[PDB]
Paper text:
Tah1 binds the C-terminal conserved MEEVD motif of Hsp90, thus linking an eclectic set of client proteins to the R2TP complex for their assembly and regulation by Hsp90. The R2TP complex consists of the AAA+ ATPase Rvb1 and Rvb2 heterododecamer complex (RUVBL1 and RUVBL2 in humans), a tetratricopeptide (TPR)-containing protein (Tah1, or RPAP3 in humans and Spag/Spaghetti in Drosophila) and Pih1 (also known as NOP17). In yeast, Tah1 acts as the direct link between the R2TP complex and Hsp90 by binding the C-terminal conserved MEEVD peptide motif of the chaperone and the C-terminal region of Pih1. Rather than the normal complement of seven α-helices seen in other tetratricopeptide repeat (TPR) domains, Tah1 unusually consists of the first five only.
To address these questions, we have obtained a new crystal form of Tah1 in complex with the EDASRMEEVD peptide of Hsp90 that reveals a swap between α-helix 5 of two adjacently Hsp90-bound Tah1 molecules. The structure of a complex between the TPR domain of Tah1 and the Hsp90 peptide EDASRMEEVD (residues 1–7 of which, S1RMEEVD7, are the only residues visible in the structure) was solved by single-wavelength anomalous diffraction (see §2) and refined to 2 Å resolution. The formation of the swapped helix dimer sees the first turn of the fifth α-helix unravel to form an extended segment of polypeptide chain that allows swapping of the rest of the helix into the TPR structure of the other monomer. The residues forming this extended segment also provide additional interactions with the Hsp90 peptide, including main-chain hydrogen bonds between the Glu72 and Val74 residues of Tah1 and the first residue (Ser1) of the bound peptide. The Hsp90 peptide essentially adopts the same conformation as previously seen in Tah1 (monomeric) and AIP structures, including the important carboxylate-clamp interaction. Significantly, Gln81 not only makes a set of new interactions with the MEEVD peptide but also completes the hydrophobic pocket into which the methionine of the Hsp90 peptide binds. The helix exchange observed in the dimerized five-helix TPR structure of Tah1 therefore restores the hydrophobic burial of the methionine side chain of the Hsp90 peptide, similar to that observed in seven-helix TPR domains. The dimerization of Tah1 reconstitutes the typical MEEVD binding mode observed with seven-helix-containing TPR domains such as AIP and CHIP and explains how other monomeric TPR proteins are excluded from binding simultaneously. The metastable nature at the beginning of the fifth α-helix of Tah1 appears to be an inherent property of this domain and is probably essential for initiating the helix swap. It also appears from our analysis that it is very unlikely that the helix-swapped conformation was induced by a crystallo­graphic contact.
Residue numbers in the entry:
A (entry chain A): 1 to 91
B (entry chain Q): 0 to 6
Write the structure that this text describes.
Amino acid sequence: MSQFEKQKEQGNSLFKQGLYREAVHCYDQLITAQPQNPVGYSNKAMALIKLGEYTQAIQMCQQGLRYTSTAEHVAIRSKLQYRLELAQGAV
Amino acid sequence: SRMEEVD
Ligand SMILES: [Cl-]
């Protein structure tokens, strides 16, 4: 495992343990170390949502998407979940 | 992993 993958597994272990602020802090180190890797932003956004920090989550999602290419094999469940939120938002 | 999970 590279250092990034080790730091990432630690953030993920904290996240799975329900230690969300702790995970955020590790995820911040992913962003710092690899600023063009969407995974830090995506992981940090989930931990933020768990904490009810919705505004910073939105900021992390927008930032991570700047470094994400197209995804051409999207699952149907994902589309149902996204379209549900998109539409709830638009109402 | 699932939508609700980390990566
Ligand atoms: Cl997907």
